[PDB]
Amino acid sequence: NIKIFSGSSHQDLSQKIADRLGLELGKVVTKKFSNQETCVEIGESVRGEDVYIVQSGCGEINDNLMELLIMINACKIASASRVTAVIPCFPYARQDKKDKSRAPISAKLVANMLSVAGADHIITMDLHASQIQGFFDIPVDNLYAEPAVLKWIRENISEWRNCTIVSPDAGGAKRVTSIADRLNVDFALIHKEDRMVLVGDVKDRVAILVDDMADTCGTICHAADKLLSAGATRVYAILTHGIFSGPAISRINNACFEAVVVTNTIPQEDKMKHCSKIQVIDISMILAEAIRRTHNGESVSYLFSHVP
Amino acid sequence: NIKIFSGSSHQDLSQKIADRLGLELGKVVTKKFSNQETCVEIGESVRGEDVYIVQSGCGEINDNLMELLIMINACKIASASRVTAVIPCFPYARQDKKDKSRAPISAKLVANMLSVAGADHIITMDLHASQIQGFFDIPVDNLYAEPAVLKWIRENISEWRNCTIVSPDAGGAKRVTSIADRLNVDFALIHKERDRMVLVGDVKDRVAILVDDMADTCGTICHAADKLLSAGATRVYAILTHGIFSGPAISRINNACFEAVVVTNTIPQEDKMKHCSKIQVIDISMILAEAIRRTHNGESVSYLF
Amino acid sequence: NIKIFSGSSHQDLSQKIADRLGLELGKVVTKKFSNQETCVEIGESVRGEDVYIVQSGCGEINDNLMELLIMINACKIASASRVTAVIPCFPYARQDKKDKSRAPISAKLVANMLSVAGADHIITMDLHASQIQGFFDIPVDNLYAEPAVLKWIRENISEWRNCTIVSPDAGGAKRVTSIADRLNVDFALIHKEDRMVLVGDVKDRVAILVDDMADTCGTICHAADKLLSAGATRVYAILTHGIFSGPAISRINNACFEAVVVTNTIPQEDKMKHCSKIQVIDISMILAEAIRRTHNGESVSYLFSHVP
Amino acid sequence: NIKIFSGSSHQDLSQKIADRLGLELGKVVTKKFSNQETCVEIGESVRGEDVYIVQSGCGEINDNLMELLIMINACKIASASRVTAVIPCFPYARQDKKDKSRAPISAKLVANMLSVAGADHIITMDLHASQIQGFFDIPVDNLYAEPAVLKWIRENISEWRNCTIVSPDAGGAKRVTSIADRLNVDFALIHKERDRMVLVGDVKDRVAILVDDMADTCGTICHAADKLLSAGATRVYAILTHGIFSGPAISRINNACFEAVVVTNTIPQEDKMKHCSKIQVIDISMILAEAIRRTHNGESVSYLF
Amino acid sequence: NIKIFSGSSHQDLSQKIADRLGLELGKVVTKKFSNQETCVEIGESVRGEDVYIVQSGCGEINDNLMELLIMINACKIASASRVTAVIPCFPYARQDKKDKSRAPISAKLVANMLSVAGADHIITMDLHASQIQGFFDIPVDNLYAEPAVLKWIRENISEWRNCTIVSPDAGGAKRVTSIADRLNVDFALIHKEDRMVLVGDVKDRVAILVDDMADTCGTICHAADKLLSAGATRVYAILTHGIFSGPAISRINNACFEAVVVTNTIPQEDKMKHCSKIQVIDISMILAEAIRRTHNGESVSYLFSHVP
Amino acid sequence: NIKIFSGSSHQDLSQKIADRLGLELGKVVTKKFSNQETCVEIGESVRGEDVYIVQSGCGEINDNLMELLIMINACKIASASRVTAVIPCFPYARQDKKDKSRAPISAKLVANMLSVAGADHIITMDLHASQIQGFFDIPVDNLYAEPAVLKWIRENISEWRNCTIVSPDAGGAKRVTSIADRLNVDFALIHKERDRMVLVGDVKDRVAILVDDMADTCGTICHAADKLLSAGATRVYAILTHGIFSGPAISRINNACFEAVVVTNTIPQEDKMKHCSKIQVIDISMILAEAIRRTHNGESVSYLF
Numbered sequence A, C, E: 001n002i003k004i005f006s007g008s009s010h011q012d013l014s015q016k017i018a019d020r021l022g023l024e025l026g027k028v029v030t031k032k033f034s035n036q037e038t039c040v041e042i043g044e045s046v047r048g049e050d051v052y053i054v055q056s057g058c059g060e061i062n063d064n065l066m067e068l069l070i071m072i073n074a075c076k077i078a079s080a081s082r083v084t085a086v087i088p089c090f091p092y093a094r095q096d097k098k099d100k101s102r103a104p105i106s107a108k109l110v111a112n113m114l115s116v117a118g119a120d121h122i123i124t125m126d127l128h129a130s131q132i133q134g135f136f137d138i139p140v141d142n143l144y145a146e147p148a149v150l151k152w153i154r155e156n157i158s159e160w161r162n163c164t165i166v167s168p169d170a171g172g173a174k175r176v177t178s179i180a181d182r183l184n185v186d187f188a189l190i191h192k193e194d195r196m197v198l199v200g201d202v203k204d205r206v207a208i209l210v211d212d213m214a215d216t217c218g219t220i221c222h223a224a225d226k227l228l229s230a231g232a233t234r235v236y237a238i239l240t241h242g243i244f245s246g247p248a249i250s251r252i253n254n255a256c257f258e259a260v261v262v263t264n265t266i267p268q269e270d271k272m273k274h275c276s277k278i279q280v281i282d283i284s285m286i287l288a289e290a291i292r293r294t295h296n297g298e299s300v301s302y303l304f305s306h307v308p
Numbered sequence B, D, F: 001n002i003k004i005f006s007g008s009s010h011q012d013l014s015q016k017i018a019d020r021l022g023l024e025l026g027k028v029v030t031k032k033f034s035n036q037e038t039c040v041e042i043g044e045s046v047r048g049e050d051v052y053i054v055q056s057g058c059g060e061i062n063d064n065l066m067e068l069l070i071m072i073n074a075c076k077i078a079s080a081s082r083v084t085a086v087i088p089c090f091p092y093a094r095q096d097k098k099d100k101s102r103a104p105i106s107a108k109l110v111a112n113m114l115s116v117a118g119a120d121h122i123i124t125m126d127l128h129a130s131q132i133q134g135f136f137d138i139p140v141d142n143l144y145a146e147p148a149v150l151k152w153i154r155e156n157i158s159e160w161r162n163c164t165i166v167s168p169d170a171g172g173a174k175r176v177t178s179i180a181d182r183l184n185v186d187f188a189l190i191h192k193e194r195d196r197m198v199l200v201g202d203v204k205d206r207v208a209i210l211v212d213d214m215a216d217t218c219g220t221i222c223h224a225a226d227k228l229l230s231a232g233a234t235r236v237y238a239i240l241t242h243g244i245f246s247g248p249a250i251s252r253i254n255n256a257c258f259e260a261v262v263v264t265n266t267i268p269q270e271d272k273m274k275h276c277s278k279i280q281v282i283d284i285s286m287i288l289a290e291a292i293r294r295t296h297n298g299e300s301v302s303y304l305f
């Protein structure tokens, strides 16, 4: 009575998850109508079932968000026992506060929408701010890429015992100090004032830029130059969410990165074809395991510091 | 105390409404971030004000819906006294029942999202099903294009007194009989055999007017027009309140035998009127502006029905 | 842990349902106090149980509605695992819109009342408008009489392959075309302007008036005359809900119907005694089966086009 | 800005209230359809108005309750600014606890239905249990008949200074001690042995006044009166705020030894006063009208307590 | 999958309950931060578990209430299957109405807080007013001390067949008549006007003052004098909740009580050390049994008139 | 129409606010019953009024929180038009995430309790995390001490133009870079090795100003000051908006090398300034009073940011 459904035609990650659980993805008719309205029909009974819907990897976020909400709704009114939204990269997470401005908190609205659509549980990876768990009243499991990142560092960078973990911004300090302490190495922080400042020593060390996401990549690219200017041996960037919109791929191809490392929370295949610096960490096992534990009532806490 | 804001790049209807009320549209930045995420910034204080957000006309339904919800949210947490969503064409209204499938009721989800976003009131025109009003617990005013459609028929069709109001499908029966009763004329109905088309009612030697709440790809309305011609209708008109016209619609209309296709201003038509000569629009900005002023003043809105 | 309860002293339908499930109806003290207030007490534990309450067949709708709400409430606060309202004929369904008027949407209020009383699930047959499912946030199963109606037609009307399915009003068009297409026959539509108009051919054919309900029967009786005037061979009327209030029974006894066919969503025994034209389709098996499937997490979709 | 509407055929209390406020009752059609379903139609715009619906006095509790809820709903979706339910006698108030049974708390269900219907405020008189106020999250004003009952006792009973205020049962203890303390007089209590009746307190050679929130079949109050007579009470009175008087109540009172039975105007009594001479009514329309005006004006309503 | 947790360091009652169920109390870090903020961490997984949290016996009610709410919250967002608040003595129960005053109904706010914190079920003993069950929408089990009180009376007071059960106030009448009828004895009632009045005969009989709680004990102490003045042979006081704040212990030591009997809904050990008149009825078995039944879907109604 | 009430025995901030608005504090009895239960009684009618409750300064966080919630509840069921909670230092704000533990989000629970109590609006100062605003669905105005802190630095520190704004931990990075950018000065950060302290950034031969949202036991801030001294900082200041100062805090500060510790008026400091000479307070009553007046009048509150 566990049922996994995928969004749109980006089965990629959701197929890996379903594979790892020994399951076929449930039958869904999932497209757009002529007037661009989202079209969904659940192709099998979900009555009394433990349902998991994995958010599509299309790229048009509002389409994918609506598709997800519509799928949640269809399953809830079709008498699913429980519906869990598996949202590897949480949409609108960077709008999680007003910022001294007359702005929306779109991440709270998104939480409210998921809730009224009928979500009983959220599974996500590396929320932009941990406080977003509090934007819901339903339980959220915020998985970490940290264990898989630590693992990637230790087996891919020889100098890891003498590297510096660097935040590209002021907001990422906690995350980098946390990784630096686990590895027992130094940390540094970049802050943009339209000019960057670096605090911390990177001289004659490998520098690893660590952030939760990379979008247009303006920031990591400038930070990498800054670090080389400060005497870093070579620069890596490791993000969980590889968004890479706009000129990101052009920017990465022209930057001084040894490698840009991301998870597959977002589909990366097409971006990798035009960008050889990108390497992907498969996190499908961490997601599959969290679903399996969720379903069985077993500890998901294991995953926060352990790689399956 | 009153503030009107518009969604994104379409401002034409919103401007017309603001004009009729002696107001400038509120300043707002409505864009998309690099990654396609909707960006909204309310450019002025809305604290203690009666706010009206008029839904955009920028085609991408999900972007327009998210933009609307975000605007509502931003206004509500910025201490607006009241927030009304003015949504001329209600999105997802055709998904208002399961229809024997394991389907979503997307129109109820939309109602729930608008409500949780913080809408206190909905103003809309010709809901696909009048029951959608009950998908909310907040008040909805469902305005009708009918009086204006009635006006247009009497004013533009010379043989209107001996005409037939035709429904493109089985579902639109009540809509056309209402119009046929008002004009004291005949009605007829078309149905697709579940496909061949069947017509019930007399259209021979008389002007046939196809009436429906909306026309999308216009496949139904264009096939219906052929069938009405074969049945000996003098000339065929198509009158829809919501002119979506997506996909092959414009090419289909031009190839069809329509004397005229009449739509309201609920969706922008300017772009489509340029490539389709037989389209005429009824301006409905006065109905909407008048519902906003009357909503704000506590005056009767039923007069407009 | 399935428990069926019945409303008031009209056990009739609910006893048939309980019979078909191999169950006795749960013990309820269910009456009115002296001041006409509804009196309910659940005579056995419902703690952790899957509870089904079938709406009474009394006739005083507000009494029956309140009784149902009170029973739902008593079971919810008595720690029932789930409470399902089995409402064969949904009250106030004809007040499902404003109708250009300053009117209530009583069907939405009724939905809101059921929800706040503690209903987790609704089972009903042939909602007056399918959009009423959207008046709830909880799952609703809207069963169809269509399969049993098609079955009744094919085995009771010899001329069924050459009949016309007729809507008594403009609102019933979809329903009749749907039945006409399945049978592969013609459809027609009556519309009242205080004068009726018929569109569609009924000449020298059996006419079957098909609607969701028959109340005072003014409309079906006038439509039957109209159809005979248009050359119909004989007229049948088949409704799911036989309300038959006011002068309906007198009206049917004086009309030109071959037969008036209804379901037992409403008790019909007393009405049949004073009206020989009425025949009943037993739908207790469709209801019993939907409860059994609901309880077991099995497909209720089977019932929408299949007769058990 | 203020509108008072009445429930169904009983308009007497509602008229008295509307009179005291210089208003006509709002026009509304309150009927039943052929199949017993409650029909309601608000005959005028309530948009932006402060609406008060006064619960009917047409006996059938479930019809009256549904009529009230439907009226509230119709007003709320018709964009009333605020809707207050004025419910002199709160329905289902005696079902306010489980009482060791697998029973409903019907009074909470009623509170929940009123709230979901869209009531913003409740005005009522002498709730069976004062805790019912907490069955809502909306404000409730619970008015008391006590000051008017006190007035009536002093005004109509000559030996009131040496009288005893008697409770018909164990539950009504706090109600009678409150009244006995206010008049500086004795109290006593009756209890049914779980039946024989037991009396605690002195009533010998003094006027006994039975006080309770309500009298329904009047079996308790009539048996209590007999027991009070056997205990040597000079004369026995019965004073209840809510005079339901269902079933054999009227015949029971006439056969009983009551000097007078006093009730308020919370339920219509005119019909019953014709067949029962000893019933007197305290008009409470002024208390209710005054709570409505004060609710509307933001003035103190506690003065009326 | 039953898990019992206790509040603060007053494991006392909760340990007895856990003992009787064959369980160890779940691991909780439960204290105050330096700024007096409540500190909680659930020391084990509660995912998919049936969770019971027993309210602490500290004495600082607002601390204990917040601790409970915080524990409920932590368990709910940690994916507990169900969370039940076991609140032997319900806080703020004496603020269950306005009382002709511009007062809060704090007991309703407390109910609303428990509900929004994530409580699915309440287990309590002898609510100050039964109407407080209606302050919730979730099921409440209001257990009675009555069976254990009747038992205590019959085996500790020889003259029980000829005693008088006395209410210390007007509000306790129903409770005492109920006990008096079961025992088949007389009842009496005290009412404070700043002077007490007694109605009912206590002359040459054992008088038992019965109330739901004893706080400062001003009222029971004055009532006991009054009863002796009226000719009672000896006076007992039996309350379910022994609060005994302020000068209660001094007051009881100086009063004419044969004995003051309370339950262990509140810890009593320290109070008994300074007051020899106090005897305790252990109600841990009634609570343990209600939890066990709750968990198993078995009848809790048994406990309302039966002692396990 | 406006009413300001204060929580319990601390009235100093509340008086200052009421003074600035030309008002007396509303009469309210805020005590504890014998058994430690919070007692509240609203001493006047709040019916139809815009009510502001200013959170107490009586140290016991749970008593103060319950007192606030009870006051809100009493006002809401007493038919206040609107209830705003003015909470200078938001309780449980540090518990705003799970932080890898099976922990509560106590700040969300608090948000939910305030909301269910009946708060319509929150006014607070320097939320520990700005995301706490989204723990509500009601509007929150999050005021900043920053402009006043900026003023104090320029006004009281002579070498401010060549100074360094230092963060006591990793988390406070964004707070100090904001201040360093505004003054056009350097920033630095301290981190505890997970313990030895590490400093990143230049502080040698320049005045170092430790800035944080709050200081509790002051262990972090005092150890940070030592490390800043060892790194050759001329003089060290500590500036916090919320000066909790619990436990050994006062003794720690006196033993530390601080030139001055600056806090706002969000928590009472009078008692602590008597035993700690280096503490200076910025009065923030004008910011709060001004947000209340502007909230009430519908005027811009963003001006104060």
Ligand SMILES: Nc1ncnc2c1ncn2[C@@H]1O[C@H](COP(=O)(O)O)[C@@H](O)[C@H]1O
Residues within 6 Å of the ligand: A092, A094, A095, A099, A171, A215, B033, B034, B035, B037
């Ligand atoms: N999809 C997006 N792409 C780029 N920037 C965004 C997006 N959503 C929000 N923002 C902005 O990013 C900032 C969030 O700050 P932080 O959370 O500290 O990175 C805010 O100023 C937002 O306006």
Ligand SMILES: Nc1ncnc2c1ncn2[C@@H]1O[C@H](COP(=O)(O)O)[C@@H](O)[C@H]1O
Residues within 6 Å of the ligand: A033, A034, A035, A037, B092, B094, B095, B099, B171, B216
């Ligand atoms: N945006 C849309 N475009 C085309 N068809 C739709 C859309 N939304 C819903 N539908 C379908 O339209 C069909 C008929 O709707 P109706 O005319 O209301 O009976 C249903 O089967 C829906 O699945």
Ligand SMILES: Nc1ncnc2c1ncn2[C@@H]1O[C@H](COP(=O)(O)O)[C@@H](O)[C@H]1O
Residues within 6 Å of the ligand: C092, C094, C095, C099, C171, C215, D033, D034, D035, D037
């Ligand atoms: N119980 C009832 N009996 C008769 N008519 C009703 C009832 N409830 C609602 N109506 C009316 O029936 C009409 C519903 O239209 P329709 O849904 O198209 O049949 C509305 O005008 C209602 O006022």
Ligand SMILES: Nc1ncnc2c1ncn2[C@@H]1O[C@H](COP(=O)(O)O)[C@@H](O)[C@H]1O
Residues within 6 Å of the ligand: C033, C034, C035, C037, D092, D094, D095, D099, D171, D216
């Ligand atoms: N309308 C009613 N008529 C008669 N008795 C009722 C009514 N509603 C509830 N009751 C019962 O009255 C009894 C006593 O109520 P109370 O006086 O509040 O203790 C309870 O056992 C209820 O079941």
Ligand SMILES: Nc1ncnc2c1ncn2[C@@H]1O[C@H](COP(=O)(O)O)[C@@H](O)[C@H]1O
Residues within 6 Å of the ligand: E092, E094, E095, E099, E171, E215, F033, F034, F035, F037
């Ligand atoms: N913790 C408490 N201690 C003492 N008295 C209280 C407490 N809580 C509420 N009260 C008061 O006790 C009375 C409750 O009345 P009753 O419920 O009849 O005992 C009210 O006047 C309350 O103000």
Ligand SMILES: Nc1ncnc2c1ncn2[C@@H]1O[C@H](COP(=O)(O)O)[C@@H](O)[C@H]1O
Residues within 6 Å of the ligand: E033, E034, E035, E037, F092, F094, F095, F099, F171, F216
């Ligand atoms: N009142 C409090 N006093 C001390 N520490 C707290 C308090 N509330 C939460 N914390 C802890 O403070 C730590 C750091 O919070 P933050 O500075 O937001 O990362 C977390 O691990 C919390 O458990």
